[PDB]
Ligand SMILES: NC(=O)[C@H](CCC(=O)O)N1C(=O)c2cccc(NCCOCCOCCNC(=O)c3ccc(S(N)(=O)=O)cc3)c2C1=O
Protein backbone atom coordinates (compact mmCIF):
# COMPACT_ATOMS: atom_id res chain seq x y z
CA UNK A 1 0.00 0.00 0.00
CA UNK A 2 1.21 3.58 0.54
CA UNK A 3 4.56 4.34 2.12
CA UNK A 4 7.67 6.49 1.75
CA UNK A 5 9.88 4.49 -0.63
CA UNK A 6 10.62 5.12 -4.29
CA UNK A 7 7.62 3.09 -5.43
CA UNK A 8 4.86 3.94 -2.93
CA UNK A 9 5.96 7.34 -1.59
CA UNK A 10 4.40 10.81 -1.58
CA UNK A 11 4.78 11.21 -5.34
CA UNK A 12 2.47 8.21 -5.82
CA UNK A 13 -0.22 8.99 -3.29
CA UNK A 14 -2.45 10.97 -5.65
CA UNK A 15 -3.23 7.78 -7.58
CA UNK A 16 -5.25 6.33 -4.70
CA UNK A 17 -5.96 9.63 -2.87
CA UNK A 18 -6.65 12.34 -5.48
CA UNK A 19 -7.09 14.98 -2.75
CA UNK A 20 -3.30 14.74 -2.56
CA UNK A 21 -3.39 17.49 -5.21
CA UNK A 22 -6.09 19.49 -3.44
CA UNK A 23 -6.35 23.13 -2.42
CA UNK A 24 -5.30 22.90 1.26
CA UNK A 25 -2.70 20.14 1.56
CA UNK A 26 -0.05 19.84 4.29
CA UNK A 27 2.68 20.22 5.26
CA UNK A 28 3.83 23.57 3.86
CA UNK A 29 6.86 25.80 4.03
CA UNK A 30 6.35 28.54 6.62
CA UNK A 31 7.80 31.75 5.14
CA UNK A 32 8.31 33.70 8.36
CA UNK A 33 8.54 36.99 6.48
CA UNK A 34 5.13 36.65 4.77
CA UNK A 35 3.14 35.12 7.63
CA UNK A 36 0.94 37.79 9.19
CA UNK A 37 0.41 38.69 12.83
CA UNK A 38 -3.27 38.15 13.64
CA UNK A 39 -4.39 40.12 16.72
CA UNK A 40 -7.84 38.51 16.55
CA UNK A 41 -6.39 35.14 17.53
CA UNK A 42 -7.51 34.15 20.99
CA UNK A 43 -4.88 32.96 23.47
CA UNK A 44 -4.11 29.28 23.00
CA UNK A 45 -5.12 26.91 25.80
CA UNK A 46 -3.41 23.51 26.03
CA UNK A 47 -5.15 21.77 28.97
CA UNK A 48 -3.39 18.41 29.37
CA UNK A 49 -3.69 18.04 33.16
CA UNK A 50 -6.01 14.99 33.02
CA UNK A 51 -4.53 13.35 29.91
CA UNK A 52 -5.06 9.57 29.92
CA UNK A 53 -2.56 7.74 27.71
CA UNK A 54 -3.41 4.16 26.79
CA UNK A 55 -1.00 2.51 24.43
CA UNK A 56 1.97 2.86 22.10
CA UNK A 57 1.89 1.26 18.68
CA UNK A 58 3.94 0.80 15.51
CA UNK A 59 1.56 1.09 12.55
CA UNK A 60 4.13 0.54 9.78
CA UNK A 61 4.30 4.30 9.06
CA UNK A 62 5.13 5.86 12.44
CA UNK A 63 4.46 5.09 16.09
CA UNK A 64 1.39 6.45 17.88
CA UNK A 65 0.72 7.15 21.53
CA UNK A 66 -3.05 6.85 21.88
CA UNK A 67 -5.24 8.51 24.50
CA UNK A 68 -8.63 8.04 26.13
CA UNK A 69 -10.73 10.58 24.23
CA UNK A 70 -14.12 9.60 25.69
CA UNK A 71 -14.12 12.70 27.94
CA UNK A 72 -12.50 16.15 27.82
CA UNK A 73 -9.43 14.87 29.67
CA UNK A 74 -6.86 16.64 27.46
CA UNK A 75 -8.08 19.44 25.22
CA UNK A 76 -6.92 22.27 22.99
CA UNK A 77 -8.91 25.49 22.63
CA UNK A 78 -8.45 29.15 21.82
CA UNK A 79 -6.04 30.50 19.27
CA UNK A 80 -7.69 30.02 15.88
CA UNK A 81 -10.05 27.32 17.19
CA UNK A 82 -13.73 27.83 17.96
CA UNK A 83 -14.68 24.85 20.11
CA UNK A 84 -13.01 22.20 22.21
CA UNK A 85 -10.60 19.76 20.56
CA UNK A 86 -9.83 16.46 22.31
CA UNK A 87 -6.39 14.86 22.17
CA UNK A 88 -6.62 11.41 20.58
CA UNK A 89 -3.02 10.55 19.72
CA UNK A 90 0.45 11.89 19.07
CA UNK A 91 3.22 10.60 16.81
CA UNK A 92 6.40 11.81 15.11
CA UNK A 93 8.02 12.11 11.70
CA UNK A 94 11.79 11.96 11.49
CA UNK A 95 14.74 11.64 9.15
CA UNK A 96 17.76 9.48 8.49
CA UNK A 97 20.05 12.47 9.23
CA UNK A 98 19.71 15.36 11.66
CA UNK A 99 19.22 17.82 8.77
CA UNK A 100 15.88 16.37 7.64
CA UNK A 101 12.77 14.77 9.09
CA UNK A 102 10.23 17.49 9.77
CA UNK A 103 7.20 17.86 7.52
CA UNK A 104 6.70 21.58 7.86
CA UNK A 105 9.73 23.74 7.14
CA UNK A 106 10.56 27.25 8.32
CA UNK A 107 12.09 29.44 5.61
CA UNK A 108 12.90 26.11 3.88
CA UNK A 109 14.79 24.88 6.95
CA UNK A 110 14.14 21.24 7.83
CA UNK A 111 14.27 19.99 11.40
CA UNK A 112 15.41 16.58 12.61
CA UNK A 113 11.84 15.57 13.40
CA UNK A 114 8.31 16.78 14.01
CA UNK A 115 5.83 15.95 16.78
CA UNK A 116 2.12 15.96 15.91
CA UNK A 117 -0.47 16.08 18.70
CA UNK A 118 -3.78 15.19 17.01
CA UNK A 119 -7.07 16.59 18.35
CA UNK A 120 -10.67 16.36 17.11
CA UNK A 121 -13.55 18.81 17.44
CA UNK A 122 -15.96 17.56 20.11
CA UNK A 123 -18.88 19.29 18.37
CA UNK A 124 -18.84 16.34 15.93
CA UNK A 125 -19.19 13.52 18.47
CA UNK A 126 -16.38 11.16 17.45
CA UNK A 127 -13.20 11.17 15.39
CA UNK A 128 -14.81 9.57 12.35
CA UNK A 129 -17.42 12.31 12.11
CA UNK A 130 -14.66 14.88 12.65
CA UNK A 131 -12.72 13.70 9.59
CA UNK A 132 -15.80 14.51 7.50
CA UNK A 133 -15.72 18.22 8.42
CA UNK A 134 -13.56 21.15 7.27
CA UNK A 135 -12.81 22.07 10.90
CA UNK A 136 -12.90 18.59 12.43
CA UNK A 137 -9.25 18.32 13.44
CA UNK A 138 -6.57 20.44 15.03
CA UNK A 139 -2.96 19.29 14.94
CA UNK A 140 -0.34 20.89 17.17
CA UNK A 141 3.06 20.51 15.48
CA UNK A 142 6.36 20.85 17.31
CA UNK A 143 9.79 20.80 15.71
CA UNK A 144 12.60 18.63 17.08
CA UNK A 145 16.24 19.69 16.76
CA UNK A 146 19.19 17.66 18.01
CA UNK A 147 20.94 18.83 21.16
CA UNK A 148 20.22 18.38 24.86
CA UNK A 149 17.98 15.48 25.84
CA UNK A 150 14.28 16.06 26.39
CA UNK A 151 13.46 14.40 29.74
CA UNK A 152 9.74 14.09 28.93
CA UNK A 153 10.52 12.14 25.76
CA UNK A 154 12.70 9.52 27.44
CA UNK A 155 9.81 7.30 28.56
CA UNK A 156 8.63 7.09 24.95
CA UNK A 157 12.17 6.24 23.88
CA UNK A 158 12.44 3.58 26.58
CA UNK A 159 9.44 1.66 25.29
CA UNK A 160 10.36 1.73 21.60
CA UNK A 161 12.20 -1.60 21.84
CA UNK A 162 8.87 -3.32 22.54
CA UNK A 163 7.22 -2.09 19.32
CA UNK A 164 10.05 -2.57 16.82
CA UNK A 165 7.93 -3.87 13.94
CA UNK A 166 4.62 -3.07 12.27
CA UNK A 167 1.61 -4.25 14.28
CA UNK A 168 3.28 -4.30 17.71
CA UNK A 169 1.66 -2.39 20.55
CA UNK A 170 2.53 -2.03 24.24
CA UNK A 171 0.79 -0.60 27.29
CA UNK A 172 1.64 3.06 27.76
CA UNK A 173 -0.44 4.47 30.62
CA UNK A 174 0.15 7.58 32.74
CA UNK A 175 2.29 9.40 30.17
CA UNK A 176 2.10 13.19 30.53
CA UNK A 177 2.30 14.88 27.09
CA UNK A 178 3.08 18.26 28.71
CA UNK A 179 6.65 17.01 29.03
CA UNK A 180 6.93 17.31 25.24
CA UNK A 181 6.13 21.04 25.00
CA UNK A 182 8.60 23.88 24.44
CA UNK A 183 8.57 26.88 26.79
CA UNK A 184 6.73 29.19 24.38
CA UNK A 185 3.32 28.54 22.84
CA UNK A 186 3.88 31.10 20.06
CA UNK A 187 2.67 29.60 16.80
CA UNK A 188 1.85 29.88 13.14
CA UNK A 189 -1.56 28.64 11.99
CA UNK A 190 -3.12 27.73 8.67
CA UNK A 191 -5.81 25.44 7.19
CA UNK A 192 -4.58 22.16 5.75
CA UNK A 193 -4.75 18.39 5.73
CA UNK A 194 -3.53 15.14 7.13
CA UNK A 195 0.04 14.68 5.89
CA UNK A 196 -0.58 10.94 5.32
CA UNK A 197 -3.23 9.12 3.30
CA UNK A 198 -6.14 9.65 3.16
CA UNK A 199 -4.83 13.28 3.25
CA UNK A 200 -8.26 14.62 4.26
CA UNK A 201 -8.47 18.43 4.30
CA UNK A 202 -9.72 18.58 7.85
CA UNK A 203 -6.96 20.22 9.86
CA UNK A 204 -6.40 23.53 11.57
CA UNK A 205 -2.61 23.39 11.81
CA UNK A 206 -0.94 25.08 14.78
CA UNK A 207 2.86 24.90 14.42
CA UNK A 208 4.90 26.11 17.38
CA UNK A 209 7.65 28.63 16.74
CA UNK A 210 10.02 27.20 19.35
CA UNK A 211 11.47 23.73 18.65
CA UNK A 212 12.20 21.32 21.46
CA UNK A 213 15.65 19.75 21.82
CA UNK A 214 16.25 16.00 21.82
CA UNK A 215 19.53 14.16 22.18
CA UNK A 216 21.12 12.26 19.32
CA UNK A 217 20.53 9.03 21.30
CA UNK A 218 16.79 9.73 21.44
CA UNK A 219 16.36 10.36 17.70
CA UNK A 220 18.66 7.40 16.99
CA UNK A 221 16.26 5.17 18.91
CA UNK A 222 13.53 6.55 16.62
CA UNK A 223 15.63 5.44 13.63
CA UNK A 224 16.02 1.87 14.94
CA UNK A 225 12.30 1.15 14.43
CA UNK A 226 11.00 -0.94 11.50
CA UNK A 227 8.49 -0.18 8.74
CA UNK A 228 8.01 -3.91 8.21
CA UNK A 229 6.40 -6.59 10.31
CA UNK A 230 8.27 -9.35 12.11
CA UNK A 231 9.46 -11.95 9.62
CA UNK A 232 9.44 -9.54 6.68
CA UNK A 233 12.55 -7.91 5.19
CA UNK A 234 13.79 -5.27 7.62
CA UNK A 235 13.39 -1.69 6.43
CA UNK A 236 14.45 0.93 8.93
CA UNK A 237 11.64 3.37 9.73
CA UNK A 238 13.32 6.64 8.69
CA UNK A 239 12.38 9.59 6.50
CA UNK A 240 8.65 9.03 7.05
CA UNK A 241 7.82 12.63 6.09
CA UNK A 242 5.87 14.22 3.23
CA UNK A 243 7.55 17.19 1.51
CA UNK A 244 6.13 20.70 1.60
CA UNK A 245 3.11 21.31 -0.60
CA UNK A 246 2.01 24.43 -2.54
CA UNK A 247 0.38 27.05 -0.32
CA UNK A 248 -2.15 28.00 -3.06
CA UNK A 249 -4.91 30.32 -1.74
CA UNK A 250 -3.75 30.29 1.89
CA UNK A 251 -2.20 32.85 4.23
CA UNK A 252 -0.24 31.74 7.27
CA UNK A 253 -1.21 33.68 10.37
CA UNK A 254 1.10 34.19 13.36
CA UNK A 255 0.25 34.62 17.03
CA UNK A 256 3.33 36.76 17.72
CA UNK A 257 4.89 39.97 16.43
N1 LIG B 1 -7.71 5.38 18.31
C1 LIG B 1 -8.24 5.04 17.00
O1 LIG B 1 -8.70 3.95 16.83
C2 LIG B 1 -8.22 6.03 15.84
C3 LIG B 1 -7.79 7.45 16.21
C4 LIG B 1 -7.36 8.23 14.97
C5 LIG B 1 -5.87 8.03 14.72
O2 LIG B 1 -5.34 6.94 15.07
O3 LIG B 1 -5.19 8.94 14.16
N2 LIG B 1 -9.56 6.11 15.26
C6 LIG B 1 -10.76 6.20 15.95
O4 LIG B 1 -10.81 6.22 17.14
C7 LIG B 1 -12.05 6.28 15.07
C8 LIG B 1 -13.41 6.38 15.29
C9 LIG B 1 -14.29 6.43 14.20
C10 LIG B 1 -13.79 6.38 12.88
C11 LIG B 1 -12.41 6.27 12.66
N3 LIG B 1 -11.90 6.24 11.31
C12 LIG B 1 -11.49 5.01 10.65
C13 LIG B 1 -11.09 5.41 9.23
O5 LIG B 1 -11.51 6.74 9.02
C14 LIG B 1 -10.60 7.48 8.26
C15 LIG B 1 -9.80 8.40 9.18
O6 LIG B 1 -8.73 7.67 9.74
C16 LIG B 1 -7.46 8.21 9.45
C17 LIG B 1 -6.38 7.71 10.45
N4 LIG B 1 -5.27 8.64 10.32
C18 LIG B 1 -5.20 9.77 11.22
O7 LIG B 1 -6.02 9.91 12.06
C19 LIG B 1 -4.10 10.81 11.08
C20 LIG B 1 -4.05 11.86 11.98
C21 LIG B 1 -3.09 12.84 11.84
C22 LIG B 1 -2.21 12.78 10.79
S1 LIG B 1 -0.95 14.07 10.64
N5 LIG B 1 0.54 13.44 10.12
O8 LIG B 1 -1.48 15.06 9.69
O9 LIG B 1 -0.83 14.78 11.91
C23 LIG B 1 -2.29 11.76 9.85
C24 LIG B 1 -3.25 10.78 10.00
C25 LIG B 1 -11.53 6.23 13.73
C26 LIG B 1 -9.98 6.13 13.94
O10 LIG B 1 -9.23 6.07 13.03
Ligand SMILES: [Zn+2]
Nearest residue numbers: 091093116195
Ligand atom coordinates in the same frame (compact mmCIF):
# COMPACT_ATOMS: atom_id res chain seq x y z
ZN1 LIG C 1 1.84 13.47 11.50
